[PDB]
Structure formats: structure tokens, C-alpha cells
Amino acid sequence: MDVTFLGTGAAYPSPTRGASAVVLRCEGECWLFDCGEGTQTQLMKSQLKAGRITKIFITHLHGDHFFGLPGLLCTISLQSVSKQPIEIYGPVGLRDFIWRTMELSHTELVFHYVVHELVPTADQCPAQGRTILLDSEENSYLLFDDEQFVVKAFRLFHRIPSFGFSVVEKGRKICILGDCSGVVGDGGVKLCFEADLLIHEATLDDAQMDKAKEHGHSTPQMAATFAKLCRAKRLVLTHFSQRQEVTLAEDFMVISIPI
């Protein structure tokens, strides 16, 4: 079980840090978390293969987290019956984006996909596919629960609504948070408790905390405080402004979680 960082930069892809994308691998099955522009080329450079991706999870509808998605699907198709659809989980709006973009570009994908949309709430920002609704008691979204994994989402605060994802082996726990300046109620501490790996943004340095919060971002001290509060075993910082063990992510870094 490992995470491969494809893009570790904030706001846009650069020559030194790609736009947001991380792949979680379990037993040859790949799950992609975020898909900024250039993700498909970062995949090509990596040891991973786009064709092995079975699920995709989008944290929020800022372009550095999803503009690479149409390209990625097209290329997977161009290079390919798959039996099971690729499952795509993300905020409301994502399903129509993909459908329209594929139609506009006259792309007939050779595989089936389904988009499951998470419904955000207005307090996340300043004042056949499923629709997935918050459970107010649990304070989370159930994405899926099978024999191997339970995967859930929780609400973050950002300039637009943003989500974190919790992956639990039925075992190891990996939590991956979208851009944020905070978490809505106890959703994070609950789901992220004793995470084996916690992936958190740290867009700006601690001296720029005011600017960070302004833009719905975090600094390393904010991430670290959340990690300590959740008793995470490992904290990995990512989504750096372009130019408990704590690791600063770089593109193509692979972190394994031993059993």
C-alpha cells in the first residue's frame, strides 16, 4: 500500500512541481486523488500506468485539481470490455463537466465511467451516478463500503467547498485533504483519528498565515496542529506555493504504509 505524488504544487503546474495529483495503490489497483493539468504526463513519467486507475476522487472544483481530467480519460481510452466502470467521485458540477467536454471533443471513451457527486454545504466557504449527501450525525459522506475498504469524505473550508477523503482498510488508514484553511466541525478529527498517513496542504509558510487563511489555505503549523489533534502517525505536506514524522512532498515521491 503506497502513495505516489504526481504533483505537489499549488494553483498551477510548473516545471518543478506538477498540479495536484496523488495515486494510492493497493495490490495493483490505483486510485487517483485530484487531477490537475499535466497529471497524465506525470503518470507517464512515473512507474504507474493510467490504465490501472479504477477510481478517481476530486477534492474541489479549482482547475489545478481537475483540469487534467478530460485529458486523462481520453488518453486511458486511446491507449486501452473493461467490465467495471471507472468511478469518479467529486463535487456537484463534475458530472456535467465531464459529459459536456467529452461530447464537445467528440470523444467516445472505450470504457464506461460513472460520476458520483458530493453535495457541499454553504458553510464550507465564505458568505448510474449517485448524489451523495452528508450524514449530519456522522458528519461525513459514505462513498463506498466493500469487503476490502470503507471510503468516506468530510467537509473542509476553502474559497470554494473542498473535501477530504478517508480510506480505511478492513487496518491501515490514509487521509487525504483538499485545499483548506480548516475543517467544518469535528469531521476531520473523527475520520482522521490515528491516520497512518495524513496528506495535508501547506501552501504558504507560517510567517504568511494571514495571507494563507485569506485564500483558504494552510501553513505548516496549521497542518501540524491538525495532525497532532488527530494523532496521525505520519504527516505529508503538499500543495506548495510555486517558486510524528513530517515529510515535505516532492513530485514522484513514493510513501509506503507497512502492514
Residues contributing to the annotated binding site for Zn(2+): 60, 62, 64-65, 158, 179, 239
What is the CB neighbour count within 10 angstroms for residue 243?
Answer: 8
Q: Which is nearer to Zn ion, 64 or 87 (CB)?
A: 64
Task: Find the shortest distance in angstroms from Cβ 62 to Na ion.
Answer: 23
Nearest Cα neighbor of 138 from 91, 83, 191, 80 is 191
Task: Find the shortest distance in angstroms from Cβ 203 to Zn ion.
Answer: 8
What is the spatial distance between Cα 198 and Cα 184, in angstroms, rounded to a whole number? 17
Binding mask 158-197 for a second copy (x = CB under 8 A): -xx-------------------------------------
Binding mask 25-54 for Na ion (x = CB under 5 A): -------------------x-x--------
Task: Find the shortest distance in angstroms from Cβ 162 to Zn ion.
Answer: 7
Find the binder of a second copy among 49, 63, 145, 244 (CB under 8 A). 63
- Does residue 208 interact with a second copy by CB under 8 A? no
- What b/e readout covers 83-115, taking b as 16+ CB neighbours within 10 angstroms? eeebbbbbbeebbebbeeebeeeeeeeeeebeb
Q: Please give the residues from 4 up to 23 whose contact with a second copy meets the rule CB under 8 A.
A: 11-15
196 is catalytic: no
9 Cβ neighbours under 8 A, 6+ residues apart: 16, 17, 18, 19, 20, 64, 239, 240, 242
What is the spatial distance between Cα 234 and Cα 137, in angstroms, rounded to a whole number? 28
* Binding range to a second copy, per CB under 8 A, among 98-106, 141-149, 177-185, 192-200: 98-106
Contact 17, 5 (CB under 8 A): no
- Binds 179: which of Na ion, a second copy, Zn ion, none (CB < 5-8 Å by kind): Zn ion
Catalytic residue among 64, 186, 210, 251: 64
- Does residue 116 interact with a second copy by CB under 8 A? no
- Binds 25: which of a second copy, Na ion, Zn ion, none (CB < 5-8 Å by kind): none
Specify the long-range contacts of residues 209-214, CB closer than 8 Å, at least 24 apart.
212/181, 213/181
* Distance between first and last Cα of the chain: 8
φ/ψ of 84, rounded to 5, equals -100, 140
Element (H, E) at 160: none
- Does residue 64 interact with Zn ion by CB under 5 A? yes
What is the spatial distance between Cα 152 and Cα 154, in angstroms, rounded to a whole number? 7
Find the binder of Zn ion among 34, 87, 117, 179 (CB under 5 A). 179
- Contacts to a second copy by CB under 8 A: 11-15, 37-38, 40-41, 44-45, 61-63, 66-68, 70-71, 74-75, 78-79, 93, 97, 100-101, 104-107, 159-160
